[PDB]
Write a protein that binds this ligand. Sequence first.
Ligand code: NA
Ligand code: NA
Length: 268
Amino acid sequence: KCVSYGVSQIKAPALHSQGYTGSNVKVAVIDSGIDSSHPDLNVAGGASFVPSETNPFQDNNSHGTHVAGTVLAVAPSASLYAVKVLGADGSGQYSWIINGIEWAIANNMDVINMSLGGPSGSAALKAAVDKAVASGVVVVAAAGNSGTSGSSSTVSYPAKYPSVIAVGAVDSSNQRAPFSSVGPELDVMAPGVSICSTLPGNKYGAHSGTCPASNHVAGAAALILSKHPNWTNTQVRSSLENTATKLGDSFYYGKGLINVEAAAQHHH
Ligand code: NA
Ligand code: NA
């Protein structure tokens, strides 16, 4: 029975104790959908942009359900939105993802979690995440799982786009997971090793990757906006990046581990 640590590691529970659980914060899980039938997962709304997989509350991959459980473990009162842009196989067209981002914008999502990416992006995709940040949305994305490539950034899109918050993985010891992607694009780190979350069919499992880490930051964003609803995505992002626990060189750790308790008491 996998046991969660990552929530207490970013210091979420300190906010919970003070009554900030992400209430009235719209979090778009732009992923493989969310198994809403999971009794621990409460999904406020959704939309599927996968022509052949038309139910966004049906996660045939399992990845988005894992995302939801972590976002909701960090931010339990957060209105969670199943934006299905990824098929059963966990891949989708950019047009689909863009449609998901477009939707997230259209429906006033406070936070986009895109626990997804790849080696390249597109003008259209950059346009979409930019547009979403211009509209005041906190865009969070996994930095990637490409480890290191010498001096080369291994940070994946859309996380590689300046507008997107790029989230690397540390373990319980704040040690960079060997798989966590690296580059100047790297902003923050968050629990991303053996991360216990919800899986389809009332199941749970540890998963590792910059995706779990991202889900914490998306949750952290939600916690921060539930204390500070009038904070811009800009202020949320600076509060997360500027109060982060310094952990190592920016290329491997960005600013370090997200401390949501510190981020939530930040003075701009
Ligand atoms: Na449910
Ligand atoms: Na970025």
